[PDB]
Each structure stands twice: as structure tokens, then as C-alpha cells.
Amino acid sequence: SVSKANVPKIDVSPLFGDDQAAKMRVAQQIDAASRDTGFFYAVNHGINVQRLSQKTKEFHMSITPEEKWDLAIRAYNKEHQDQVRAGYYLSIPGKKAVESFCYLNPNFTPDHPRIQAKTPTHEVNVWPDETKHPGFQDFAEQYYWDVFGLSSALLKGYALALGKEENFFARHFKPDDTLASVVLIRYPYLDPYPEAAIKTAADGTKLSFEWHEDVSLITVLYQSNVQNLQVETAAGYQDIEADDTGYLINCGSYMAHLTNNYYKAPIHRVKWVNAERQSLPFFVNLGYDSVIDPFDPREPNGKSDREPLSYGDYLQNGLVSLINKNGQT
Ligand SMILES: CC(C)[C@@H](NC(=O)[C@H](CS)NC(=O)CCC[C@H](N)C(=O)O)C(=O)O
Numbered sequence: 279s280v281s282k283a284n285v286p287k288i289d290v291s292p293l294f295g296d297d298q299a300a301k302m303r304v305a306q307q308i309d310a311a312s313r314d315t316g317f318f319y320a321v322n323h324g325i326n327v328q329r330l331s332q333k334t335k336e337f338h339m340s341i342t343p344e345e346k347w348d349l350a351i352r353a354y355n356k357e358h359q360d361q362v363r364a365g366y367y368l369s370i371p372g373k374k375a376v377e378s379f380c381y382l383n384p385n386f387t388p389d390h391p392r393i394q395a396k397t398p399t400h401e402v403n404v405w406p407d408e409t410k411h412p413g414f415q416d417f418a419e420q421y422y423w424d425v426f427g428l429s430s431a432l433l434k435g436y437a438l439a440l441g442k443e444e445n446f447f448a449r450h451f452k453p454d455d456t457l458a459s460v461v462l463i464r465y466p467y468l469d470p471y472p473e474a475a476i477k478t479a480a481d482g483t484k485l486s487f488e489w490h491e492d493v494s495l496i497t498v499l500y501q502s503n504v505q506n507l508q509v510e511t512a513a514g515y516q517d518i519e520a521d522d523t524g525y526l527i528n529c530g531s532y533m534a535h536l537t538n539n540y541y542k543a544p545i546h547r548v549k550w551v552n553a554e555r556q557s558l559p560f561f562v563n564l565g566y567d568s569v570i571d572p573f574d575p576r577e578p579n580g581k582s583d584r585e586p587l588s589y590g591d592y593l594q595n596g597l598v599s600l601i602n603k604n605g606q607t
């Protein structure tokens with residue numbers, strides 16, 4: 279049968295401090311995980327994930343069909359042509375079980391020059407009515423900055439792991455322009471569960487979401503305590519154990535590009551499980567014009583012939599491709 283992936287628990291707390299050797303020891307653990315299955319759990323991360331789960335559940339479980347249409351992305355509501363990324367992603371009973379709510383940088387307002395210029399991938403977030411959902415927007419925006427702070431620290435770990443100065447990635451990850459997103463995903467319990475919402479992998483495994491590489495620099499994921507993720511290895515898919523106290527971390531394909539695939543973007547998929555649960559990714563994206571010069575840590579001179587890829591073009595191309603390959607979520 280199906281083996282279990284080695285997903286080490288890494289105490290990331292030194293990355294918030296000034297003990298440089300302790301940070302190097304974290305970096306070594308990140309390097310090792312990134313060169314093996316590509317996943318690790320960040321522990322001692324400083325975020326109240328219990329409050330995150332509770333507030334998210336309160337939102338998912340209290341929003342009405344009317345509110346969902348009013349917040350829907352353009353894939354579900356033609357009136358909302360400016361909502362490609364941010365908003366509500368509806369379930370379709372009998373056909374599509376998952377639903378979700380995506381939001382972007384709270385600093386994208388009508389005053390922001392990327393909104394004024396109508397640059398692709400930048401949108402103003404949409405929110406439900408505050409009195410129907412008291413505290414939800416406050417919680418969600420606070421959470422964005424809490425996970426931004428964790429992610430910055432993790433990026434310092436990744437930079438050190440690759441032999442760079444600690445700000446090599448983080449200097450491009452800024453509150454004024456980050457394209458990072460939070461998605462609050464509900465995977466429901468359904469009885470009967472409609473087979474139309476279940477995909478069958480080549481290997482026979484029943485899936486809710488097919489294999490993919492993440493469109494991100496890194497991905498910083500909370501999930502409730504229901505095992506579902508699998509990572510591809512040469513010997514087949516391996517189960518990633520759940521941990522509802524930590525953050526599951528992995529690289530996306532922008533990291534693979536800039537490291538000449540030294541830190542691969544691990545291919546992974548979501549098993550079908552008939553259980554009520556949450557999947558709350560934070561996709562760590564840079565700014566639209568951010569460019570990291572590629573390098574090859576395998577080569578003595580570190581030189582890579584790969585082209586510098588602008589983050590915004592990478593993101594626009596990647597989000598569209600992922601919809602085409604794995605379906606509109
Ligand atoms: C694997 C999990 C992270 C999750 N899947 C996902 O979140 C999948 C694959 S990483 N991600 C996406 O569809 C991209 C959403 C991007 C977001 N709307 C945005 O505009 O930035 C799941 O639980 O299905």
C-alpha cells in the first residue's frame with residue numbers, strides 16, 4: 279500500500295530572534311526537508327491557529343446563498359468582472375463539494391496605484407456585511423498580517439538554507455505590494471457524497487483535487503485534523519500526516535525556478551475524505567515587479583542560465599494554468 283511521508287517538525291522560533299547560529303540550525307532543517315519530500319511542519323510559530331479555525335468556521339457556517347452570490351467571483355457571477363481572485367467560490371450541490379473565500383493584501387484599496395493602474399492580479403477585497411458577520415473582516419485582516427509575519431521569518435530560513443543573506447527573499451515580501459492571498463476553504467461532510475464531486479487518479483485513488491505544483495514562492499498552510507494530503511515521490515504518493523497545531527510549509531514553482539530546481543515545488547494532491555474540515559492556505563507571493571536572479575546552489579560558482587522571471591507575470595500565467603489543468607475551484 280501507501281507509505282507515509284517524512285514531514286519533520288521544525289521549531290522555527292529562532293527565526294524571529296537574533297541568535298544567528300540557532301537560525302542556521304533551523305535553516306539546515308529547512309534545507310534537508312526541501313531536498314527530501316519538500317514539506318515540513320513549522321512549530322512554535324506564534325499564531326493562534328485555534329482562533330483562526332474558530333472564526334473561519336463561524337464564517338463558513340453562517341453565510342447564506344444570498345451573501346455568496348453577492349461576494350462571488352466572476353466564475354460564478356458575471357456581474358463581478360473585476361473579481362478574478364478575491365471573493366466567494368461557490369459549491370454546487372450534487373457536483374462540487376468544496377467552497378472557499380479568498381482575500382488579498384488589505385492594502386489594495388482604490389488609492390493604491392496598482393488598483394488605479396488596473397494591473398492584473400491586484401484587486402480590492404470584498405467582504406460580507408459586518409452586522410451579519412461581526413468581527414469577521416477584522417479577524418481576517420489581522421490573520422493576513424499574522425501569517426505575513428510568520429512567512430517573512432520562514433523566508434529568512436529559506437534564504438539562509440540556500441547560502442544567502444537572510445533578507446534575500448524577504449526584501450521582496452512587503453506589506454505595500456505583496457500579491458499573497460489567504461483562502462478559507464471548507465471541505466464538507468456530505469451524506470450521500472456525490473460521486474460527481476470525486477475524481478479518480480491514474481493510480482485509482484479517489485481525490486478532491488488533482489496533482490499540482492503550487493503557484494507561490496512558498497505556501498504556509500493550516501489544516502484541521504483530517505488527513506488528506508499526499509506528496510509525490512519517485513516511488514509513488516505518500517500520505518502527509520495532519521497536525522492542527524502547526525503550519526505545513528512547502529515551496530512553490532517560483533522557488534523551483536529561481537533555484538534551478540534545487541528546491542523543487544513538490545507535486546501533491548488532496549485525497550477525497552468524507553469529513554467536515556478546513557484548508558486555510560496562505561500563498562506567499564512577492565510584488566508584481568519583483569524579480570529574483572536565479573542561481574544554482576549545486577554549481578561551485580552558483581551560476582544559472584535561467585531567465586529572471588517577473589513575479590506578476592509568473593503569477594498571472596500560473597493561476598490561469600492551474601485553473602485550466604485542475605478546474606475552477
Ligand atoms: C492544497 C491546499 C493548499 C488546497 N488547494 C489549493 O489551495 C489550490 C492548490 S495549492 N490552490 C489554488 O487553487 C490557487 C488559489 C489561488 C488564489 N485564488 C489566488 O488568487 O491567490 C486544498 O486544500 O485543496
Ligand SMILES: [Fe+3]
Pocket residue numbers: 490491492546
Ligand atoms: Fe497545493
